[PDB]
Amino acid sequence: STIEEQAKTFLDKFNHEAEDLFYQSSLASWNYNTNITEENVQNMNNAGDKWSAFLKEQSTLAQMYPLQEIQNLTVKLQLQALQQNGSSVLSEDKSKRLNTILNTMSTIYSTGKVCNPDNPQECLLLEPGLNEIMANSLDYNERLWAWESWRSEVGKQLRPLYEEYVVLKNEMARANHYEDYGDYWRGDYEVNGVDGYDYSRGQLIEDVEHTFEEIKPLYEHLHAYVRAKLMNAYPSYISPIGCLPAHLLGDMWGRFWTNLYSLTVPFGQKPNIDVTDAMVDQAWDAQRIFKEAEKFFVSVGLPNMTQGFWENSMLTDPGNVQKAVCHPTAWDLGKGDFRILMCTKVTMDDFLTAHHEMGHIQYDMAYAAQPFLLRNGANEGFHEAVGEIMSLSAATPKHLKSIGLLSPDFQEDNETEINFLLKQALTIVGTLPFTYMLEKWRWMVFKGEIPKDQWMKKWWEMKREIVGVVEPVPHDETYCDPASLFHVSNDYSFIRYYTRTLYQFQFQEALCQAAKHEGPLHKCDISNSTEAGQKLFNMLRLGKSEPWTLALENVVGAKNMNVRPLLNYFEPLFTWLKDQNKNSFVGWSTDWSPYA
Amino acid sequence: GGNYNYRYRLFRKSNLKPFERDISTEIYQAGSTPCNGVQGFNCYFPLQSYGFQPTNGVGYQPYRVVVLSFELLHAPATVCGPKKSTNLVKNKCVNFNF
């Protein structure tokens, strides 16, 4: 018999027994999160360790198959996930020491404590408190001290750990036929199947700068606006030739500039749109919010929600000793089980996050008919992009008024539109250069271009140049800024958000054309458009069974990743930046430093 | 706790003829080598149990299916409905089907 038939039989044996175990593990995890009790902890442990102890031998038998003659691009693709060595390439000692290192690194990062000189006994952590102090305060010196303490009592001891972790991961990747860990991370954006839609690992690297180059003028104008606002802010700190330091970004790493939105208000007198008080006046609970959002999704064209979601899934306010961690999540337990995990309240952010999670759940049903190993998106960004598209499109004033919240006579003018556009830009595009520089730094440090001594200086100089962030206090080699990061201390990819922003902008823009809407892109509404919903479901149904290059062919007409939705969205804001500061010059100089 | 008392045939040498009932439970050979009744490589059990759960979605919950087959061969027919009857009238010119 041919090898393909044997592989098909092996997959048929594997998937049926694997789906039940995965469902059991997911149900145990959901029970543990729904009921915070001691017994649920070992219940989850004993229902989750068996999944790994089964998948290990399932992947063990998928090596004797000669995976060089299987065809149809699906059976081989399905077996490739089974043909994954994982971390067994190295010996037991190296693997166990890496596991212990990761565990202790996570514990140290989660146990970051900094004590003020006045009270060396009571420290402060990254939980609200120290983080709250350095986010919504006014004093410059205390913010600088907090930043120095965070970078000095956390990142100092992680330097040797990261130094050995990088080389160990590179060695394991080399044992896994991957010369670099960056190549291992980019392997998600790699397809070698149908002719004309194939992609290479190195293509993503060049595409990153080829899509980042054209957004540079917008970032430079936004930086000039921020510097002008800082001129309106504290004097004798920021120079009009240089750029602002790290701790004035408003965040511990400067990912988001939402905390600086108050300091950079465009006009001030115009307030943002908010009907939370109107929501309360109409007696809006979580049930009403969810029902209205589901009606909006139905008007979009998404399939009707099945029964059991309202019952099995937890919605709001567990209340008493029956505790439950309710970090907003969308759970796909398998076997036709989809749930939400929430603590919803009367606020705009809760509305948008509920829309986000239920869109994630809808996408989960979208690829439900696909096999177990193909019940995911084409790449890591599509899932989050589809989740956030509905939240982005449901915040328009037209949608707020259409659901009986805004007044029927409400009229929007240019000032509030500019305010909303600036607020959205300060949160969306304010992290793209940071993501780009972080990803490039991680990629080259995994490749090995920069030596051990040239580790911090390169990172800081590229932050000064590309991003425009200078040193508030100098650090030569004894700290590690990337070490004090969630995605670096936990081995999480960060290019996912970079791809996700462009993907969601592309999909929203394409729906805007195929939704019969005219006007500014920020006011575009995808509601009451069955054709747009069907077009979206055309790609959502594809799931992981199709390449991401083929996935980027139904929503938009271009397979390659284009960035023109980002510029098309902020056109009025870009013109406002053009004609507002006619005296100041954009850009920054890297020679200037706050300390020297 | 999961109902695993119901099983179904998963691997067979070929299809099944109409109105045929097979209960064979023997190891399945997916290659050109004997298994000797051992679930080794290319050796799978033809029967797989079901994992019915009350929390499973619609379409995975256990369903009961019964087919009724009607035949009419040379022997006289004997299964059919009650052939309901009307009431009785008298002393009037009518027509009857006694």
Residues 308-347 of A with CB under 8 A from B: 308, 312, 335-337
Q: How many CA atoms lie within 13 A of A591 on its CB side?
A: 1
Burial level of A595, CB count in 10 A (0-12/13-18/19+)? exposed
Name the one residue in this structure whose structure tokens are 């030739």: A241
Question: How many beta carbons lie within 10 A of that of residue B15, not counting itself?
Answer: 7
Question: Which tokens go with A421?
Answer: 């556009």
Q: How many CA atoms lie within 13 A of A107 on its CB side?
A: 6
Cβ-defined contact of B41 to A336 (cutoff 8 Å) = no
Whole-angstrom distance, CA of residue B24 vs CA of residue B46: 8
Q: Which residues neighbour A344 within 8 Å (Cβ) at sequence distance 6 or greater?
A: A286, A289, A290, A315, A316, A350, A353, A354
CA dist A338 to A148, A365, A571, Å? Answer: 44, 8, 39
**Residue B3 DSSP SS3:** strand
Q: How far is Cα of residue A481 from the mean position of the Cα atoms in its chain?
A: 20
Q: Write the residue in B28, B31, B59 that is nearest to A336 by C-beta.
A: B59
CA of A3 vs chain B CAs: smallest distance (Å):
9
Amino acid at A355: H
Helix (H) or strand (E) holding A124: strand A123-124
Bridge partner residues of A114 (DSSP): A124
CA dist A139 to A144, A335, A594, Å? Answer: 9, 54, 16
What DSSP string runs through A81-103?
Answer: HHS--TTTTS-HHHHHHHHHHHH
Interface test with B, best of A23, A307, A332, A333 (most B CBs within 10 A): A23
User: What's A483's DSSP letter?
Assistant: G
- Residue pair A481/A155 in contact (Cβ under 8 Å)? The answer is yes
* The dihedral formed by the CA atoms of A66, A71, A73 and A75, expressed in degrees to the nearest 10: -60
Amino acid at A175: A
- Residue pair A301/A540 in contact (Cβ under 8 Å)? The answer is no
Residues 141-180 of A with CB under 8 A from B: none
Q: Which residues neighbour A438 within 8 Å (Cβ) at sequence distance 6 or greater?
A: A482, A485, A494
Question: How many beta carbons lie within 10 A of that of residue A443, not counting itself?
Answer: 20
Chain B CB contacts of A312 below 8 Å: 55
Question: Which tokens go with B2?
Answer: 């999961």
Start-to-end Cα distance in chain A: 75
Question: Which tokens go with B91?
Answer: 């002393």
Q: Write the residue in A9, A23, A307 that is nearest to B44 by C-beta.
A: A9
Whole-angstrom distance, CA of residue A162 vs CA of residue A173: 16
CA of A191 vs chain B CAs: smallest distance (Å):
30
Active site residues of A: 357, 487
Size of chain B, expressed as the number of residues it contains: 98
Choose among A265, A233, A240: nearest CA to A138. Answer: A233
- Residue pair A331/A338 in contact (Cβ under 8 Å)? The answer is yes
Cβ-defined contact of B30 to A61 (cutoff 8 Å) = no
Choose among A19, A16, A11, A95: nearest CA to A61. Answer: A11
Helices of type H across A324-413? 348-366, 380-393, 397-402
Whole-angstrom distance, CA of residue A284 vs CA of residue A133: 33
Choose among A151, A113, A117, A407: nearest CA to A254. Answer: A151
Size of chain A, expressed as the number of residues it contains: 596
Whole-angstrom distance, CA of residue A575 vs CA of residue A271: 21
Question: Which tokens go with A389?
Answer: 């598209």
What resolution in angstroms does the PDB record give? 2.8
Q: Write the residue in A9, A20, A23 that is nearest to B30 by C-beta.
A: A9
* The dihedral formed by the CA atoms of A485, A170, A103 and A23, expressed in degrees to the nearest 10: 100
Cβ-defined contact of B58 to A307 (cutoff 8 Å) = yes
Whole-angstrom distance, CA of residue A176 vs CA of residue A499: 26
